[PDB]
């Protein structure tokens, strides 16, 4: 399954941008891109302030139910007794 | 071909070693004869048969 | 979207479905020749549907063919026919009048 799914909150780890929380819009898995809304605006001088894809390695999930809104890794293991595969943090126990 | 049709004994290839032992290819052709023969249903037929096989047939009384 | 026509009467009415689908497929392509075909996406879907129905037919010992077991055009053909009649009558009349 995919670590990043279109529609969730996410931040950037490295680059000129830091801590850029935003909603992801599109994923190009064959070339490992992600379109995060509201960040990395390449000023196209058409013959605009659209955004440009950021690599999956830079992106990292962002928890909201934690008191300390930190950034951590993920596990696909946690399978509900009455449901299918899910996401869960490693140094925590909070689904997605 | 120049081979009989009871067996398939065809020509043979060797060398024409003349005096002083020079080499030249030459063909040995089996001796074929058209002597007739009678099958055991009637159907007496004429076929090209080698003389050695003619002797074999003669001594076996196949005519 | 395939098992839903296995349940359906997969022996007779499917050829009527196929001939219909052929009808609007041909009409869609003819409109595509001109403009005014605002939904080109229909062609691929209808071709795919033909493919599915033909597969459902060919799994069975059947063929979509041989299962089949004009208002004013006739008037225009008529007028053409008596026009030809009048021309032939005039021609024969003149030819015999020459003699």
């Amino acid at each position: 399954m995919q670590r990043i799914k279109k529609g969730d909150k996410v931040v950037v780890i490295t680059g000129k941008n830091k801590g850029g929380s935003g909603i992801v819009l599109k994923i190009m898995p064959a070339r490992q891109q992600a379109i995060v809304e509201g960040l990395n605006k390449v000023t196209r001088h058409k013959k605009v302030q659209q955004e440009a894809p950021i690599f999956l390695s830079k992106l990292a999930l962002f928890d909201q139910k934690a008191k300390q809104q930190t950034i951590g890794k993920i596990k696909y293991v946690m399978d509900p007794k009455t449901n299918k595969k899910t996401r869960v943090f490693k140094k925590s126990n909070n689904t997605l | 071909a120049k081979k009989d049709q009871l067996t398939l004994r065809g020509p043979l290839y060797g060398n024409n070693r003349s005096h002083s032992k020079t080499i030249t290819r030459r063909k040995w052709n089996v001796n074929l004869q058209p002597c007739k023969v009678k099958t055991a249903d009637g159907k007496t037929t004429r076929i090209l048969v080698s003389t050695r096989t003619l002797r074999t047939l003669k001594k076996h009384n196949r005519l | 979207t395939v098992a839903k026509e296995l349940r359906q009467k997969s022996s007779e009415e499917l050829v009527k479905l196929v001939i219909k689908l052929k009808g609007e497929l041909l009409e869609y392509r003819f409109k595509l020749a001109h403009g005014e075909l605002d939904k080109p996406h229909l062609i691929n879907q209808t071709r795919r549907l033909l493919a599915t129905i033909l597969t459902i037919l060919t799994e069975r010992k059947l063929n979509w063919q041989e299962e089949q077991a004009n208002e004013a055009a006739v008037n225009a053909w008529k007028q053409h026919l008596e026009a030809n009649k009048a021309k032939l009558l005039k021609s024969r009349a003149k030819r015999e009048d020459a003699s």
Partner: protein
Amino acid sequence: DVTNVLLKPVLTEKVYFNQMGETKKYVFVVNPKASKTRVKLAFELVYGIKPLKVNTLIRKPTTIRGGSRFPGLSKLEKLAVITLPKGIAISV
């Protein structure tokens, strides 16, 4: 009768110039493997009007895109004009 012999109608200025006559010579491009009898039978089955005459021609493939580092070949197609009785017309 499969109606896989009526590929497309073509609309060119020559076609229109023939349309503003009175016979209304409709034209189509057809399956190259088909024949005039098949074309007229298909036309009868698809519209209901028995044609008056059918004429055909085929455009041989030619070099297309000229010199463009990837030249290709054009399409071999057969055109079948379909005359009608003088007093009739239909859409397409």
